[PDB]
C-alpha cells in the first residue's frame, strides 16, 4: 500500500444527500452459469465487489440485478431495491449502471460532455448556475480538474488516458446524483497504479453515503486489499459473502488454509473451479455453498436542442472525416466532369448526356450508403446505452440526427454539384442549374434516409450493408436508362415507381432536354414524358417522408443492440 501514490486529497466534494439506499436479493435463481440460491443484502456506505464467475454467459450478474440480460429471463426469486420490488422504472430512477465499454464522443472535451449530460439529466427547474455548480462538483469529486479542458478522444486520437476516460464515464453516470452505483469491470485494460487509484476513488464514492457494486473477474492483490465487502461466485453459486480481510480466516476456520505467498482470491477461485472430474469438483463447490448457508423534465424541445448541439459540436471538429469526404466528392466531381468534358470542338451527343445524367444520379449513392452506415454503426452502441439510461424517448433524437446531418449533407451536395454542371457544358442559365441542384440534393437526402433506416433496422453491420446494396442495385436496374423502363412486367415496374434513381434520371432528362433539343419529341419517343417536373419533386418528397417514417418506426420499435 506504500508503493502507490499517496499525495492525494481524501475529501468528499459531491456526496449523496438523502435517505440511505438499500439492495436486498433473496434466493435469486437464474436460468440460462446456473445461479443457484443467491442471497445478499447491502446498504449505503458499503462497497460490494463480486469476484469469481460474475457472469452467466453474455450477461453479467449486475445486469441480472438491474433487470437487463441478453440470455434467459425466467427468474425464481425476489429483488428488493430501497424496500420495493424490482421494476424497470425503479432501476431507471435510482440505479446507475456503468458499462465496461465507454460511450464518449472523441471530438468533445470533458466539460462540454459533462454539461450536456447534466442538461439532459437535471430537470428544467434547475437554473444554469445550478447546472454549472453540479458539473464543477462532479469534476472536483473525481479529481478531473487538470484535464477538464482536454478532449476525451478515443484510440487513434490524442485525447486523454484510459483512467481519465473511465473517470469521465463515471462522472457522466453520476451527474444526476444516483443512490446506487453499478460498474462492470472498471479496471479492465488499465495500469496497476491506475487501477489502484480508480479503486480508491470508487471506495471514496461509496463512503459518501452511496452503494457501489463492482464486478471483477481476476482482481489483483492490491485491489483485493482495498475491498470493503466481497462476494465469491463460482459457477453461479456463492461461496463467501462478507469482509475481504476475513475471507482467509473464514476459509481457515472451515478447513481450507491459504498458503503463504499466494493471492487469496485466485487461490479460492481455482480451488473450487469447475473442470469424471467435473462431478468430483462440483460436489466440492456444493459442499462449500451449503456450508456457507448453515453458518449465516426537461422536455422534448430542450432534449432536441441539446442533442443537435452535441452532434454539431462533434461533427464540425472531426477534421479527418470531413477531409476524406471532401476529397472523395472532389474526385468524383472531377472524374465526372473531365470524362464528359463538353467544351471543345466535338460537343456532347444525346446518349452521352443521358449517360452523364444517369451516372451523376446513380454514382453517389454508393459512397452515401457507405458513409451513413459507418457513421450509424460507429455510435449504435452509444445510442442504445443512452436510450436505455432514459435520457430521451427517441422522439426528438430523430429530428436531432436529421438536422445535425443536414449541414454536412448540404456541403457535400455543393461540393459534388459545383464542378459538375459547368465542366460538362450543360444547359446554361440559373433556373435549370438550381433545379438540377435541388433534385440532386433531394435524391441524395432520400438515399441518406434510406441508409439510416437500413442501419437502424438490421443489427449486423455486414447484413445492413448487404441489404442497402441490394436495395441500391434494385433501384439502379429499375432506372430508365438500363432496361429501357418499358420491359418490366409487374415487379420491376412497381420497383421503378418507388425508385428515386429513376425519378432523378427522368427529372434531369426533363430539365436538360425540354425545349432545348438541337422540343418534346426526344422525351415522346422515350418514356420520360408521363410525369411533370413538380410531380417528380413531390414523388421524391413522398419517398423521403416514407423512408423517414420507416426509420422512425425502426428506431422506436427495434432495439439497437450492438
Amino acid at each position, epitope marked *: 500500500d506504500r508503493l502507490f501514490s499517496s499525495e492525494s*486529497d*481524501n*475529501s*468528499l466534494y459531491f*456526496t449523496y444527500s438523502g435517505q440511505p439506499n438499500t439492495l436486498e436479493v433473496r434466493d435469486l435463481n437464474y436460468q440460462v452459469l446456473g445461479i443457484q440460491n443467491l442471497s445478499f443484502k447491502v446498504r449505503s456506505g458499503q462497497m460490494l465487489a463480486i469476484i469469481g464467475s460474475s457472469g452467466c454467459g453474455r450477461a453479467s450478474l449486475l445486469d441480472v440485478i438491474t433487470g437487463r440480460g441478453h440470455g434467459g429471463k425466467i427468474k425464481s426469486g425476489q429483488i428488493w431495491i430501497n424496500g420495493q420490488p424490482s421494476s424497470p422504472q425503479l432501476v431507471r430512477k435510482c440505479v446507475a449502471h456503468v458499462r465496461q465499454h465507454n460511450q464518449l464522443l472523441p471530438n468533445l472535451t470533458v466539460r462540454e460532455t459533462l454539461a450536456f449530460i447534466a442538461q439532459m439529466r437535471l430537470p428544467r427547474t434547475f437554473s444554469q448556475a445550478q447546472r454549472d455548480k453540479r458539473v464543477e462538483d462532479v469534476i472536483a469529486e473525481l*479529481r478531473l*480538474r*487538470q484535464c*477538464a*479542458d482536454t478532449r476525451v478522444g478515443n484510440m487513434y486520437v490524442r485525447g486523454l488516458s484510459g483512467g481519465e476516460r473511465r473517470r469521465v464515464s463515471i462522472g457522466v453516470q453520476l451527474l444526476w446524483n444516483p443512490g446506487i452505483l453499478i460498474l462492470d469491470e472498471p479496471t479492465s485494460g488499465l495500469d496497476s497504479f491506475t487501477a489502484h487509484n480508480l479503486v480508491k476513488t470508487l471506495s471514496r464514492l461509496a463512503k459518501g453515503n452511496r452503494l457501489v457494486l463492482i464486478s471483477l473477474h481476476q482482481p489483483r492483490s492490491d485491489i483485493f486489499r482495498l475491498f470493503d465487502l466481497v462476494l465469491l461466485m463460482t459457477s453461479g453459486t456463492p461461496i463467501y459473502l462478507g469482509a475481504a480481510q476475513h475471507m482467509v480466516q473464514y476459509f481457515t476456520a472451515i478447513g481450507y488454509p491459504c498458503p503463504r505467498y499466494s493471492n487469496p482470491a485466485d487461490f479460492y477461485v481455482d480451488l473450487t473451479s469447475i473442470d469424471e472430474q467435473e462431478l468430483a469438483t462440483r460436489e466440492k463447490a456444493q459442499s462449500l455453498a451449503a456450508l456457507f448457508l448453515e453458518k449465516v423534465m426537461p422536455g422534448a424541445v430542450q432534449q432536441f436542442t441539446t442533442l443537435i448541439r452535441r452532434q454539431i459540436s462533434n461533427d464540425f471538429r472531426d477534421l479527418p472525416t470531413l477531409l476524406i469526404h471532401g476529397a472523395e466528392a472532389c474526385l468524383m466531381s472531377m472524374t465526372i466532369g473531365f470524362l464528359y468534358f463538353g467544351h471543345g470542338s466535338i460537343q456532347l451527343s444525346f446518349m452521352d448526356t443521358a449517360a452523364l445524367l444517369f451516372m451523376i444520379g446513380a454514382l453517389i449513392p454508393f459512397n452515401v450508403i457507405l458513409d451513413v452506415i459507418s457513421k450509424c454503426y460507429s455510435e449504435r452502441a452509444m445510442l442504445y446505452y443512452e436510450l436505455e439510461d432514459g435520457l430521451y424517448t427517441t422522439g426528438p433524437y430523430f429530428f436531432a440526427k436529421i438536422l445535425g446531418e443536414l449541414p454536412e449533407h448540404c456541403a457535400y451536395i455543393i461540393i459534388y454539384g459545383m464542378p459538375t454542371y459547368w465542366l460538362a457544358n450543360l444547359r446554361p442559365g440559373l433556373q435549370p442549374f438550381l433545379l438540377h441542384f435541388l433534385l440532386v440534393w433531394l435524391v441524395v437526402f432520400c438515399c441518406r434516409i434510406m441508409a439510416l433506416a437500413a442501419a437502424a433496422l438490421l443489427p449486423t453491420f455486414h447484413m445492413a450493408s448487404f441489404f442497402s446494396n441490394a436495395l441500391y442495385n434494385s433501384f439502379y436496374l429499375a432506372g430508365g436508362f438500363m432496361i429501357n423502363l418499358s420491359s418490366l412486367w409487374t415487379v420491376p415496374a412497381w420497383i421503378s415507381k418507388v425508385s428515386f434513381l429513376r425519378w432523378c434520371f427522368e427529372g434531369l432528362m426533363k430539365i436538360q432536354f425540354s425545349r432545348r433539343t438541337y422540343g418534346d419529341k426526344i422525351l415522346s419517343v422515350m418514356e420520360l414524358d408521363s410525369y411533370p417536373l413538380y410531380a417528380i419533386y413531390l414523388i421524391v418528397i413522398g419517398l423521403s417522408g416514407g423512408f423517414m417514417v420507416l426509420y422512425y418506426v425502426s428506431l422506436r420499435f427495434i432495439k439497437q443492440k450492438p
Partner: antibody
Amino acid sequence: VKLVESGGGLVQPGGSLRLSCATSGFTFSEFFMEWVRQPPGKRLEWVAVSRNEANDYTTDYSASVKGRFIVSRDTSQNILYLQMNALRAEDTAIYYCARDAWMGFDYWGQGTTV
Amino acid sequence: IQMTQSPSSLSASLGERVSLTCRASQEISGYLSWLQQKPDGTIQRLIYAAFSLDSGVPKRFSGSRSGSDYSLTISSLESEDLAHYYCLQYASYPCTFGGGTKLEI
C-alpha cells in the same frame, strides 16, 4: 460572511498555543475550514483543512505540520480551533482563516501574529 | 505545481493599465484565483476561475489567458490599489500559491 482570528501572542519554542476563528454569516456545518499562514518574508502557505459534516469532520495537515498541529471545530458556537504544539521554531506567521479551498480561497479573515 | 508570478514588484501612476502575469508549472484548465492582501492585513478574493469576479469587486479587474500564462489586468488604477497580489491554483492537491507582486502607486 465574516471571519475573526484571535489567539496570537508571544510563546516560547516548544510550547503550546490555540488559535480561534469565529464564523458568522453562513452555515458552519456545510462549508470547509482552512488555516493559511504567511511567513514574514515568504509566500502564502496552506497549513491544515477541517472538512464539513459530510466528511465526519475529518482533518488533514500539510507535510510540514503533520503530527504537531491539531485542528478542530465546535458546532455549538461555530468557532474553529487550531492547537499548535512545538511551535515558534519556524512556524511564526500571520495565520489566516479561510472558508473554501477547492472552490477558490474566498472570504478571508484578518489574521493574527503568532 | 509551482506558481511563478511576475513581476516581483511594479510601480505605476493613477489611470495606468497594470497587468500581472502568473505561470503554472502544469495545466490547471483555468482553475486560478487572485487574492488582494491590503496593507492592513485583510485579504479579499477579487477574481475566481481566472475569468469571473466576486461580489462587490469593481468591474476594472479582468482576467485573461494566453496559452499557459494567466494575466490579471487592472484598468484605471486608483489610490485603493496599493496592495499585494497572489495567484493560486486549486485544480491539483495540494493548493499552492504564487510568489506575489507588490503593486505601489
